[PDB]
Design a protein around this ligand. Structure first.
Ligand SMILES: CC(=O)N[C@H]1[C@H]([C@H](O)[C@H](O)CO)O[C@@](Oc2ccc3c(C)cc(=O)oc3c2)(C(=O)O)C[C@@H]1O
Length: 623
């Protein structure tokens, strides 16, 4: 939890009471565990919805949906049960409440089970299941000089009539909301990303939406891959972005521009960025994923635990900030090594809050955190992004002013700032590690065996912000070679392995003063010529499985070659710059590199021309 931030235990395990209703009688009843946080703003009234697991934290046990609400930004709260279960058996339950705010209404979607003690995805049929929508109406009043609110919860209505018996190549079984907070789309539609099972017990995600304020519901025709559960969605630039849980695998993210009729994996931006554990081989989690506007910039906030402990412990809740280009780790929201899986982030009246789980010995509370420190960090980072984009965009490039330097898709930039061991990203997301480097204007001068910089891709580890490069990228740099090498030496490239010896696309230079562009594992043909001490502009592009190399804005002869053989997606380890940065590779590149730009797409001709012409105007040195 950041400096300046604080929290309280809001839903207190084995302590907080809720009004338990049974057979016409209501009693204040202590709850064992509270899980499944959803924290929202209903026109000024903060509402926290969760599971109240009365007797045990076990999923298949007695559970009602509880709500706490506050008209004073969380200093005090009132408590009620928003939805009660059927009371059919000792384990009846309403589960995984998923919330949408619209007007003064809360729409809460829950699965309902009567008596099964088995996890829902293990059921062979729907005998124990129903899917219910309950609507809470929030009313505001000003009694006794001060503001008051109340919420009237309607009786739940079953939406089972909207679930078809068949979907493309399958027979349907059950479905649930994705948990947490869902959305109202820019067209007014209520939009629940849902997790669905078929009769083969496979799980997949769909879009379940209503065009009439929840009276009737439809499914989008498309779906995620099998294995994608607890989907969470937001709307971004006219499309739904659906971020999914995949147990034992990296999270998949899809985009849909047609209410779920067609799903496209977001390979160029967010898909496969987030891993559920250090080795991405453990259960995943529910995630808060929202689009907000902070100081005028639309961005997305995303949370997920790091899960160093493994299994479902899910320690180390982390918050991430992205503008769909750069991906910044705000940091850890939970405290120390506590188990802290599910979460919900709310941005309200320029203050940031998080309602999230803490779990000790399988007893769960929900803490309510005031994210003061994190918002300060976010605002600082957003200012940097805005300032560097403005700087670049405002440059008058050589003709009159020619076309502007492009910042669309610009993800990282290594320039003047560097410490003894790192080359700093101007965008503050991913630095490069360095060896044998001396600082020069807008870059670094390298020498010696082991020299160079490494800008990690898969080497980022659990969370791989540059995963997009496996699909498309442009890497740009200005370079100068200081010594003629003994053989062939590296200058810039994308490596598939940790050593640099297995390349996707790279540029080397040799003892005969020629360039050696390297296309995958293809035989290298030296070409062109360079002069010692002369500055050159280098561009490497890859898209559509094809790599190209440009020197001074022009392609090398014979460039535009296949660098991804076969159907497998590359798994780039890192970009190397100015050497391999590997003391085990015997090369010694004596070179200076300045202003390394990384884009998440293949730049066009004009954009490459502009960068070449403007190469002496883009550095961060004077700023
Ligand atoms: C309807 C329902 O079962 N929802 C639960 C959800 C769900 O089981 C998973 O997404 C798998 O379908 O997992 C959760 O519950 C689980 C599921 C399984 C386990 C297991 C197997 C061990 C454990 O320690 O905690 C668990 C917690 C989860 O925290 O991931 C939350 C929800 O309670």
């Amino acid at each position: 939890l950041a400096p300046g931030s604080s929290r309280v235990e809001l839903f207190k395990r084995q302590s907080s009471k809720v009004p338990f209703e049974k057979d016409g009688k209501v009693t204040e009843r202590v709850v064992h565990s509270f899980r499944l946080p959803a924290l929202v703003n209903v026109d000024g009234v903060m509402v926290a919805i969760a599971d109240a697991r009365y007797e045990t934290s076990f999923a298949n046990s007695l559970i009602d949906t509880v709500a706490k609400y506050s008209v004073d930004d969380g200093e005090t709260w009132e408590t009620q049960i928003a939805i009660k279960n059927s009371r059919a058996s000792s384990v009846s339950r309403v589960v995984d409440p998923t919330v949408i705010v619209k007007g003064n209404k809360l729409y809460v979607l829950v699965g309902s089970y009567n008596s099964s003690r088995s996890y829902w995805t293990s059921h062979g049929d729907a005998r124990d299941w129903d899917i219910l929508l309950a609507v809470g109406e929030v009313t505001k009043s000003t009694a006794g000089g001060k503001i008051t609110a109340s919420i009237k919860w309607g009786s739940p209505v079953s939406l089972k009539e909207f679930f078809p018996a068949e979907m493309e190549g399958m027979h349907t079984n059950q479905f649930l909301g994705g948990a947490g907070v869902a959305i109202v789309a820019s067209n007014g539609n209520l939009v629940y990303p849902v997790q669905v099972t078929n009769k083969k017990k496979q799980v997949f995600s769909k879009i379940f939406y209503s065009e009439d304020e929840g009276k009737t519901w439809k499914f989008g025709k498309g779906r995620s891959a099998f294995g994608c559960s607890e989907p969470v969605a937001l709307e971004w630039e006219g499309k739904l972005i659906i971020n999914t849980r995949v147990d034992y695998r990296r999270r998949l993210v899809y985009e849909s521009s047609d209410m779920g009729n067609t799903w496209l994996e977001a390979v160029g931006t967010l898909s496969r960025v987030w891993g559920p554990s250090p080795k991405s081989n453990q259960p995943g989690s529910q995630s808060s994923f929202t689009a907000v506007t902070i100081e005028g910039m639309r961005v997305m906030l995303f949370t997920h635990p790091l899960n160093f402990k493994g299994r479902w412990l899910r320690d180390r809740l982390n918050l991430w900030l992205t503008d769909n280009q750069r991906i910044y780790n705000v940091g850890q929201v939970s405290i120390g090594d506590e188990n802290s899986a599910y979460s919900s982030v709310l941005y309200k009246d320029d203050k940031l809050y998080c309602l999230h789980e803490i779990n000790s010995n399988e007893v769960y509370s929900l803490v309510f955190a005031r994210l003061v420190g994190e918002l300060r960090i976010i605002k600082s980072v957003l200012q940097s992004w805005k300032n560097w984009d403005s700087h670049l965009s405002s440059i008058c490039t050589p003709a009159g002013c020619g076309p502007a330097v492009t910042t669309v898709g610009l993800v990282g930039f290594l320039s003047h700032s560097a410490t003894k061991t790192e080359w700093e990203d101007a965008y503050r997301c991913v630095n490069a590690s360095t060896a044998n480097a001396e600082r020069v204007p807008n870059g670094l001068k390298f020498a010696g065996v082991g020299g160079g910089a490494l800008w990690p891709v898969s080497q980022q580890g659990q969370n791989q912000r540059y995963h997009f490069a496996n699909h498309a990228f442009t890497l740009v740099a200005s370079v100068t070679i200081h010594e003629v090498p003994k053989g062939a030496s590296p200058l810039l490239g994308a490596s598939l392995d940790s050593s640099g010896g297995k390349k996707l696309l790279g540029l080397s230079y040799d003892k005969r003063h020629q360039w050696q562009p390297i296309y995958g594992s293809t035989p290298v043909t030296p070409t062109g010529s360079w002069e010692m001490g002369k500055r050159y502009h280098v561009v490497l592009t890859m898209a559509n499985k094809i790599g190209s190399v440009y020197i001074d804005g022009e392609p090398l002869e014979g460039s535009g070659q296949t660098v991804v053989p076969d159907e497998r997606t590359p798994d780039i380890s890192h970009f190397y710059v100015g050497g391999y940065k590997r003391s085990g590779m015997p090369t010694d590149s004596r070179v200076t590199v300045n202003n390394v730009l990384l884009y998440n797409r293949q730049l066009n001709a004009e954009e490459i021309r502009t960068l070449f012409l403007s190469q002496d105007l883009i550095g961060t040195e004077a700023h």
